[PDB]
Design a protein around this ligand. Structure first.
Ligand code: A1B4N
Ligand code: ZN
Length: 139
């Protein structure tokens, strides 16, 4: 679990969005596993606008932060799950690191701000949904 809170927006994994997220929907994209809902309170986070390929993510299944080198956002094949059919997920960045399904929503940050959230994993890999190209989150 986990979300990004920026301005009057809440960014969550689309497969973990609640009834309240869908009732206050701003934008969603199944191919990216992202959903953004509106909030009444001002958020605590800020978004990186950079090309960093290293950073630190929070792993709830270890209660620890880990440093990572990750690939540039790209279209990657993701096996079928209870939430989606087998498909290509876009804007996904991979890194070597521990993750379990409940780790989705953990934030990946660099020195500039939030880069993305955990969205995929397995066999010593962890995949993050990028949010740096969503410029409208800042206005
Ligand atoms: C070890 O398993 C995981 N670890 C972290 C996050 C996720 C998994 N499991 S997953 O990649 O199969 N995943 C399951 C939930 C939906 C996700 C999606 N973005 O399509 C894909
Ligand atoms: Zn950066």
């Amino acid at each position: 679990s986990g979300a990004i809170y920026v301005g009057n927006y809440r960014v969550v994994n689309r497969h973990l969005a609640t009834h309240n997220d869908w009732a206050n929907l701003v934008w969603e994209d199944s191919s990216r596993d992202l959903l953004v809902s509106s909030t009444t309170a001002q958020g605590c986070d800020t978004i990186a606008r950079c090309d960093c390929q290293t950073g630190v993510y929070y792993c709830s299944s270890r209660r620890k932060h880990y440093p990572v080198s990750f690939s540039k956002p790209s279209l990657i094949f993701v096996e079928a799950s209870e939430y989606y059919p087998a498909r290509y997920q876009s804007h996904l960045m991979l890194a070597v690191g521990h993750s379990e399904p409940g780790d989705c929503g953990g934030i990946l940050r660099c020195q500039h701000g939030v880069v993305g959230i955990v969205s995929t994993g397995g066999n010593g890999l962890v995949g993050f949904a990028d949010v740096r190209d969503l410029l409208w989150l800042d206005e």
